C-alpha angles and dihedrals in degrees: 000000000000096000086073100063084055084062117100116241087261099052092049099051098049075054095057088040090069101035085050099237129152109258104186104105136074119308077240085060096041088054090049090041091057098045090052089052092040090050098041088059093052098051110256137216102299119117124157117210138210 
């Protein structure tokens, strides 16, 4: 998550690349595009209760 903001522009694009994310925007948006990608995959934080 934060890993990805050390990579150069370069590096976190070729990232995106194969994880088919949309690296136009700012190195600022791919590393938060990654987090949210990383973190999606995880789970996340999301529970309904009753």
């Amino acid at each position: 998550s934060a890993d990805y903001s050390s990579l150069t522009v370069v590096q976190l694009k070729d990232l995106l690349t194969k994880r088919n994310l949309s690296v136009g925007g700012l190195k600022n948006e791919l590393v938060q595009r990654l987090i949210k990608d990383d973190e999606e995959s995880k789970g996340e934080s999301e529970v309904s209760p009753q």
